[PDB]
């Protein structure tokens, strides 16, 4: 929110960070079962993105990066490749959040985890 991914979410969606860090079955810590909607699928993919970074030896949950937003889009930067990779995962997710604003549903914010059912899609 005052931190990097949160700041990117706010810039790209017009929403508060708090409206995406606990949404559906995947936005927020961990994730299981079937994503509730397209925005949730952005978070399923983002989780997979961090998994890939972790396997490369990065710590994406802790990496801090630099970025700007202009009209060509989101520009990523950071001293290290792991910082830039984390930015790239976040950028993809924030763009996915913006793309799917049309089906964002307030009822899925702070979704009770017990409501998550079905299989867990593979990465
Ligand atoms: Ca998650
Ligand atoms: Ca939720
Ligand atoms: Cl991704
Ligand atoms: Cl990879
Ligand atoms: Cl900026
Ligand atoms: Cl962009
Ligand atoms: Cl843009
Ligand atoms: Cl640094
Ligand atoms: Cl690195
Ligand atoms: Cl709504
Ligand atoms: Cl809203």
Residue numbers in the entry: 1 to 123
Reproduce text from the manuscript describing this model.
Two are apo-hGIIE structures at the resolution of 2.0 Å and 1.9 Å, with different crystallization conditions: without (apo-hGIIE_1) or with calcium (apo-hGIIE_2). In the hGIIE-LY311727 complex structure, Ca1 is 100% occupied, with the extra two coordination from the amide oxygen and phosphate oxygen in LY311727. In the apo-hGIIE_2 structure, crystallized in the presence with 10 mM CaCl2, Ca1 with 100% occupancy is seven-coordinated, and two water molecules provide the extra two coordination. In the apo-hGIIE_2 structure, Ca2 is 39% occupied and coordinated by carbonyl oxygen of Gly24, Tyr111, three water molecules, and either the carbonyl or carboxyl oxygen of Asp22. Amide oxygen in the 3-side chain and one of the carboxyl oxygen in the 4-side chain of inhibitors are coordinated with calcium instead of water in the apo-hGIIE_2 structure. Similarly in apo-hGIIE structures, a water molecule, part of the second calcium hydration shell, forms a hydrogen bond to the carbonyl oxygen of Cys27 and links the second calcium to the oxyanion.
The mammalian family of secreted phospholipase A2 (sPLA2), which are Ca2+ dependent, low-molecular weight and disulfide-rich enzymes, plays key roles in many physiological functions and pathological processes by catalyzing the hydrolysis of phospholipids at the sn-2 position. GIIE, the closest homolog to GIIA, is regarded as a “hair follicular”, “inflammatory” and “metabolic” sPLA2. The structure of hGIIE consists of a typical set of three major helices (α1, α3 and α4), two β-strands (β1 and β2), and three short helices (α2, α5 and α6) around the second calcium binding site. Similar to hGIIA, hGIIE has seven disulfide bonds.
